Amino acid sequence: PQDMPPPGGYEAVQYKRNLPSRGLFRPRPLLAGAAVLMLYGWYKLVKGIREQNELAREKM
Amino acid sequence: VQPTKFAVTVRQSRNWADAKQRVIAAYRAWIRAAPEIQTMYSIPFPVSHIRTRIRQEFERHRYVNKLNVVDVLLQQSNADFQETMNFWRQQSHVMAFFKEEHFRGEKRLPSNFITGFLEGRN
Amino acid sequence: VALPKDAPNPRAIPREPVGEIKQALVNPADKYQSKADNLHKYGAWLMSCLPKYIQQFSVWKDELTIYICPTGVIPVFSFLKYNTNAEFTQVSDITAVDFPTREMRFEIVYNLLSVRHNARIRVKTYADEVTPVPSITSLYMGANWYEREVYDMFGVLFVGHPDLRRIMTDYGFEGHPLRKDFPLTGYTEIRYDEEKKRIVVEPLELTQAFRNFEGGSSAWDQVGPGIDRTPDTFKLPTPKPE
Amino acid sequence: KVEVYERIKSLLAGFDKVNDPNNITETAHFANDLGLDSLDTVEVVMAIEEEFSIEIPDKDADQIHSVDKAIEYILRQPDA
Amino acid sequence: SNAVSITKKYTVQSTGIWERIRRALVIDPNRSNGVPLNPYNRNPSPGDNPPLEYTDPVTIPAGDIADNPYWKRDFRRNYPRPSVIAQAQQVALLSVGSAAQPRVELIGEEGTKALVAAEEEGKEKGVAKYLEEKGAEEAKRVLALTGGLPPTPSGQTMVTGQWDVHKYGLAEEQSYGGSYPCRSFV
Amino acid sequence: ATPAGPPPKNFRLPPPKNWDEESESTIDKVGKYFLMTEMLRGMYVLLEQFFRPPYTIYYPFEKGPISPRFRGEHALRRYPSGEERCIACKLCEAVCPAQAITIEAEERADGSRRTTRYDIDMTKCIYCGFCQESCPVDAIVESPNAEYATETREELLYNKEKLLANGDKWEPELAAAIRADAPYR
Amino acid sequence: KGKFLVPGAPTGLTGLGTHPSPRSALLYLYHSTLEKLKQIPEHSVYRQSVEAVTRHRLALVESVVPEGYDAWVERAKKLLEEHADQFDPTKVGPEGGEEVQGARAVKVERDGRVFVVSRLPKEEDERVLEWDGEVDEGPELEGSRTLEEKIEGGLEKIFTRRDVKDTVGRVEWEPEPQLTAEQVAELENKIGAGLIEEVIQVAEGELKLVDTMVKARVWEPLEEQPRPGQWEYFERKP
């Protein structure tokens, strides 16, 4: 015979746009995530510099 | 003019008086441009030698007595002039116009019957 | 390899057998007779509206051709551009054909498109070596390069064209290659010369000459005269008997 | 002026298309007196344009047909 | 949803711990990697397709041995000649009508000469002169041929059964929706 | 622009929306701008490809796929007895779109119709298969070979000796390719 | 809200914006066409064809009336008579005057019907406009000037230009009511030739066409007969 489609017909294939949204790129959790790192970092930086400042007192 | 540097809109000549002005205008632009043509394509000839070629080109068509044919020759002259003054031609194109720079010479036809016959149709 | 669970082998599905295939005989010209009358009527109306310039029209299958004298090029294309029943607002193509047996050897062919009416029209005029044609650049911007191509290949002047120069051939090229009398390989050829240290034009010389098998054309005509398909609304009446 | 004429002789006498030198005058014509055809005249005005380093318009060039006409024309032009 | 299942897309899949890793990290787990499967893709090679299986098909009207004379299916030699109308022919078509619709009776004698009169008149005076002598009524008659209004150019699609324009309309499904400046026309 | 008839339903776009009327919150709008969300998403796509198998094959140790129809280097073929298949019909010389074939022929010493010259200019040939389609005896064929680049252009002017040697070397491929595709020819 | 289309709003076809007063523009164009066709003979089919299409489309444009048109027309007609010097082109020019900061308006006559063309200052941001859009003609010529350069500097404009606030003797032109968006769609559904903006474009082109046809006299005998064999191809003899 000849190259023919299957008797049922080939199943439908994906062609419509599929770029689904994901939570890893929504800005609201990203903004919350960035704020926490900055807040945590400044908490550690206040404690760090205050300690460093006390070390200069002892050294002097 | 408007489309590109030396672009001349195609127009018919109204009469023989109109045509003669264009022909003299075309010759004037050509021999005026001869100094620039030399230095622009680094032609190994003097402007005198180049300007002689311009006159001979205009003299091949000196005997034309038909107005429509003149319009065709005028359009060709403008097209050649534009593609020369714009650096669209290359040195190979302009140099090929000088018949002396072919390695078989410029006298590319036999002088008389017996020279062509002895060499074999030129 | 790791296969997909729901993607079975598409070659492994047996195909239903095929037996006695039957295909009807179709004349492809028959489907255009539905509009044959309308195309003649449109051509006739154009001739009535512009009788000073339209010499004839022809209808082949769904293609309407209009034949005009060179002087009417601007008026005719203005009408085809701006008339409410002719909104051929695009120039699909402009080209030329050479017919040395004709006194006006050059046939100029314009193909137009009307998106509004979903229609096409052909306009033919004629020209010579020394007889120009009006440029339609003032009506169609797209026409600019098409007319340069016609001028480059055929040597036809378009009066009113801005910047009519060569578009395809080399600078300083001599001749118009689409003329029937212009030979296939032309007159000259180039090479690099090691003395001049540059490219040089020289007379053409072929290591193997072109072999033209045109003489093998059939000694018998193979197509025939064809079939007349003029509609009845454009054929003359006939006298009844007695 | 007179300085222009002495420069005018410097090119017309050097021109190889003159019928006979010393035929130049203060009012000689290229065609009638000097035997110059159309294009030889076009070339002479172009040589004068080079000497005074001033471009000459085509209409003005058509007006120039005599040695005096050129001498008058160059004086009117500011550049020289 | 837009996506088809990765389990139906003819590409190498991940397995075991690596499929769970893939479904946990990628942007869309239904997206294939474009690697074709070796047992299914070009298997067998076309050079090992059994030659005896393929059959060169013949349609029985064109390929019968009994009832197909060539001249009945010789559609090349039945090509339509171009139908040409000059200014003389249209004047005749205006003066005496057509074979589908005549203008006068034209019955036998005195009509054959009357018909040829409409031909030589068409040759001598073109369409313009003919109309000018006859006047505005003839002009209305030319438009009366097309039903009063001037005709419209024929369309180039016959999907609806008649030659017409294609009726472009917005598709009920916009692929970009409205978030982008591109509209789907059906 | 639009087709004749009434305007397509809803062809006219609604009027533009002002900044005030945009249906998207400021925090989301400011966040995407400063965080470059869509650029981060595009970068994440590359990492997904970074861990997918590459498509590269290691040529010349591995080769890409070709079909029995593949059009490569020309060859002249024999019968199983060793007689030349070519009978100088000149069908391939006539059909050749590039005029790449030159043939001369007379009667052979035994009176057989055979060629004396069979040249193919491989620098004129467009590799279209028309000669192979026109040959009534399967004499001229294109081999699957494509790896025959040469140092000089003269090496690409094939005469009858070069072509018959090519057929002798490539015959089992030539027969296999003919075997697979002859049903479709 | 969406009752009236917004002038300048994109239609969908790039560079084709929504028309400011589309119904009156069509009336202006159609009437201008019929008047311009009166210089063509009556036996020209070209004239007979354009008339049929235009008078038919004209009838349809008149078939759609903006709400409150009758109320507007009485006052607008009443306004022309009492202030004719304000709108006559022979006095203020075809553009309505040299004042762009102000509103201009000119009465015009076509095909036995009268139209008023109006021009308005472009709505521009106040942060960027200088002197409320008044045209900058450079500075005045100070110093020691000849009379000639003074006249070349438009000194006579001092005696004829009007301050933009100066509206003592003149009146405010009131615009015609507009067709609604519903009315525009149903009208162009009647014409069946695309969007109202495209239909106006076709009317503008058709108006332009008449001048070419008259200058070419396309209704007279064939200009050049086809010489024998001009249109002979390779057709076999039947």
Ligand SMILES: *P(=O)(O)OCC(C)(C)[C@H](O)C(=O)NCCC(=O)NCCSC(=O)CCCCCCCCCCCCC
């Ligand atoms: P004078 O009386 O001597 O002559 C005046 C004219 C020439 C008008 C004749 O008397 C005359 O009647 N001629 C008949 C009509 C005529 O003039 N024909 C038109 C000819 S135009 C023409 O020949 C254009 C050629 C231009 C060629 C220029 C040089 C070639 C290009 C390359 C330049 C060098 C390389 C860069």
Ligand code: SF4
């Ligand atoms: S190769 Fe084949 S087609 Fe060509 S001459 Fe030989 S037999 Fe004829």
Ligand code: SF4
């Ligand atoms: S492959 Fe095509 S071009 Fe090459 S020799 Fe055969 S017919 Fe000629």
